[PDB]
């Protein structure tokens, strides 16, 4: 059975919950503390795996303690890591995150050696016959365009039933990523890119950005508590409410859980409306849980 | 040569070395990062190892990756882990440590909650004929006294020449530990404890607290830049100046280096006076060093 590939960043977050932020030069105990693999492409694989869809992660890593921990996690959850671009030097990104018990505050100390990004030449070496869906976390745009072009060229030599579906996320606020909009069957734009572009709601954003997508494509924008919306080539704006959990305990990865869910659903041949709804159910559920496990 | 046994915590410390201490609700970018075996008894075994002294660690660990790292590290250093108390489930202690670059202060967010402690039951299964010196990190006091009494019971049927020497560390400001004083030939008390009880200097700390030890014991107190002092049965107050590094960069475990150096010095039949200086020479140098390698 063909897998879903997710190209993006990975990170080891060490998350600590405390009652009060630590005064310098002190030793205090934790309420809780967990080690969690993260990064957008990385979380989507976590969700795709729990939802029972075979998937693969491709990103940059370097050998070391963190990579070892990260690869172990991937494997345990069944995520394929064969396509990973290993680098000669640097460390795989890691961070320690202290979380305040009442204030909700989050201080992050981050270790990141600027590993070269997955390049077009890295992606040339990936055999595409294994994949049914590919999803690219927008980062180094001009290289990623080459990748998307490579996929486009692949699809032209294939019957429709066997074409690879492609999705793209534009989640950081940078001029360079705009070029991604023109590729992919599904394009995810985040609230924060949307608001930074001056848009005040998911409706405006879709209607404002749709002109930038390849013909036939679908633009999706999830707006947290206000649900999620989408716009297709037929111009009807599809909506889903959010599914707020009784208490929102953890938000880290909710957007990644949204995207993976929409991908999974469209992947299973469901409709955009259905996929929007599904994305919202799963994301809301995750928000009432520590990490990703209890989603399914 | 018989082994020195160290009883207490073992921890996988995630050190992050930063420019300035970070402000709450902010994302600072790390200078360097690493994993270190830590925990008080654990660090003392690292130091005891570097001096060339055979040693063994006893504490609670639990199956998983964290234990794999720590155990591996114990072996890299020759430390005997056969006396360890393996639990069936739960997670081995781990922590997030932030070290300042300029001042060199260390801030610890420890996670030592999961596992049950080394019980007095566990300790009876220890062949006391293997060790010449048993050191106990003061933690679960009421069980630790049982262990100490069992050692006292053992010494009774052994001549002065070949009789196990015992020490205790009182490092946390929790009343529960006050009992431990009456046991052990050498009783380490820290600056963090001394100040909690209202003591201004290392001298007044020893004077006030000596009535608490057993007849003929040695009360030690290290006080960072102000060296370290000691008081025995005779009553002559021995002191030592501090040997500061050319540039203080890492304080994390400096106390655990002092203790270890004093224990070592003493077990090799030197005097309290010489022991102190050695504690200060080595503890000091460890402060100009990122890690424990190079302290001798």
Curated annotation (Swiss-Prot), chains A, B:
Pathway: Carbohydrate metabolism; fructose metabolism
Activity regulation, free text: Requires potassium. Inhibition by ADP.
Substitution effect: residue 41 to T: In FRUCT; no effect on ketohexokinase function; decreases enzyme activity but no effect in substrate affinity; decreases thermal stability
Domain of life: Eukaryota
Entry keyword Metal-binding: no
Binding site for ATP: 106, 224-227, 253-256
Signal peptide: none
InterPro entries, per the entry: Ketohexokinase-related, KHK, PfkB_dom, Ribokinase-like
Tissue: Most abundant in liver, kidney, gut, spleen and pancreas. Low levels also found in adrenal, muscle, brain and eye.
Gene Ontology cellular component list: cytoplasm; cytosol; extracellular exosome
Enzyme Commission code: 2.7.1.3
Enzyme class: transferase
Keyword field: ATP-binding, Carbohydrate metabolism, Disease variant, Kinase, Nucleotide-binding, Transferase
Binding site for beta-D-fructose: 13, 39-40, 43, 256
Catalytic activity: beta-D-fructose + ATP = beta-D-fructose 1-phosphate + ADP + H(+)
GO function term, MF aspect, one: fructose binding
Record note on what altering residue 38 to R does: In FRUCT; loss of ketohexokinase function; insoluble
Pfam families, sorted: PfkB
GO biological process, one term: response to fructose
Quaternary context: Homodimer.
Illness association: Fructosuria: Benign defect of intermediary metabolism.
Family membership: Belongs to the carbohydrate kinase PfkB family.
Role, per record: Catalyzes the phosphorylation of the ketose sugar fructose to fructose-1-phosphate.
Protein name as it appears in the record: Ketohexokinase
Organism the protein comes from: Homo sapiens (Human)
């Amino acid at each position: 059975e063909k897998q879903i590939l997710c190209v993006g960043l990975v990170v080891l977050d060490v998350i600590s919950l405390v009652d009060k932020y630590p005064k310098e030069d002190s030793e205090i105990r934790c309420l809780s503390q967990r080690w969690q693999r993260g990064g957008n492409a990385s979380n989507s694989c976590t969700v795709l795996s729990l939802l029972g869809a075979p998937c693969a992660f491709m990103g940059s890593m370097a050998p070391g303690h963190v990579a070892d921990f990260l690869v172990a996690d991937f494997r345990r959850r069944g995520v394929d890591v064969s396509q990973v671009a290993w680098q000669s030097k640097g460390d795989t990104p890691s961070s320690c995150c202290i979380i305040n018990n009442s204030n909700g505050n989050r201080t992050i100390v981050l270790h990141d050696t600027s590993l070269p990004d997955v390049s077009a030449t890295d992606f040339e070496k990936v055999d595409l016959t294994q994949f049914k869906w590919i999803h690219i976390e927008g980062r180094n745009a001009s290289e990623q365009v080459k990748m998307l072009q490579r996929i486009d060229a692949h699809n032209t030599r294939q019957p429709p039933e066997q074409k690879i579906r492609v999705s793209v996320e534009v989640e950081k606020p940078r001029e360079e990523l705009f070029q991604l909009f023109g590729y992919g069957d599904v394009v995810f734009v985040s609230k924060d890119v949307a608001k930074h572009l001056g848009f005040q709601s998911a409706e405006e954003a879709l209607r404002g950005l749709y002109g930038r997508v390849r013909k036939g494509a679908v633009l999706v924008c999830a707006w947290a508590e206000e649900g999620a919306d989408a716009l297709g080539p037929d111009g009807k704006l599809l909506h889903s409410d959010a599914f707020p959990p009784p208490r929102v305990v953890d938000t880290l990865g909710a957007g990644d859980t949204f995207n993976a869910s929409v991908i999974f659903s469209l992947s299973q041949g469901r409709s955009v409306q259905e996929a929007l709804r599904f994305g919202c159910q799963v994301a809301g559920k995750k928000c009432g849980l520590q990490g990703f496990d209890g989603i399914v």
